[PDB]
């Protein structure tokens, strides 16, 4: 399956999704620091067997 650039991310706190708009990319001018999010991207994964 194909990856997405959706702005929804599994189990991420809203403190991280503050800068990036609903489209997924970060804003223009938002002062970021270490470990922040710049582009929301999620990849399809099955085959758990936990």
């Amino acid at each position: 399956g194909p990856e997405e650039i959706t702005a929804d991310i599994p189990n991420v706190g809203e403190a991280a999704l503050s800068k990036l708009d609903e489209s997924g990319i970060v804003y223009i001018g938002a002062e970021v620091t270490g470990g922040d999010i710049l582009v929301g991207k999620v990849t399809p994964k099955g085959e758990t067997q936990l």
Partner: protein, 230 residues
Amino acid sequence: EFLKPRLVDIEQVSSTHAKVTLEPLERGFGHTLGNALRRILLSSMPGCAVTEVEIDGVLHEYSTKEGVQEDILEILLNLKGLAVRVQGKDEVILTLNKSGIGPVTAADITHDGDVEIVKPQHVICHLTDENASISMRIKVQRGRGYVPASTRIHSEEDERPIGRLLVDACYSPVERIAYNVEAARVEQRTDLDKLVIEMETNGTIDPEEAIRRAATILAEQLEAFVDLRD
């Protein structure tokens, strides 16, 4: 059996220059009060300077407004050297609106009672187009020392806007303080010294007020020795 010095005349050579003299010093105390005063004034005088600017239609520092002839990276480096003294409050929020061709000097800031600009011929930017328009909202604070934008970020507390261009703030109303002790002369005393503190502020702080706030920073600190608590 000691002597204690008294404040004497304050020759005011210019607006940013000054010379204050401390007349009746006992021998051996010239270099003791001087270097203990030059080392305080250059370090910890409270002042006021810009803290964060905000322009109308620009998002970050490395942009370039249309109509002006400087990058925004230079409009902040010109505001940082803006001298201003506020009397009543602790912090202000200035304003600046101008349109038309001609250099935008600092004297075009909106006039408030307490806020009192000192260098009204200061250049800030240029305007070079008849339909140009620049409107910012400068900020001002009190403090001392020097606190860069990076270390003042730790107390950001969710700085929601993305148009808050942050400037580094170096509050200090002194730039160089030379002093030289010379042979004072009371009517009859073998050896008495005279201190002459040739100061140089940025037009902000009163000279006689600086020394009366540099002495109480010393005299307040020696208490920990006068009462050796153990």
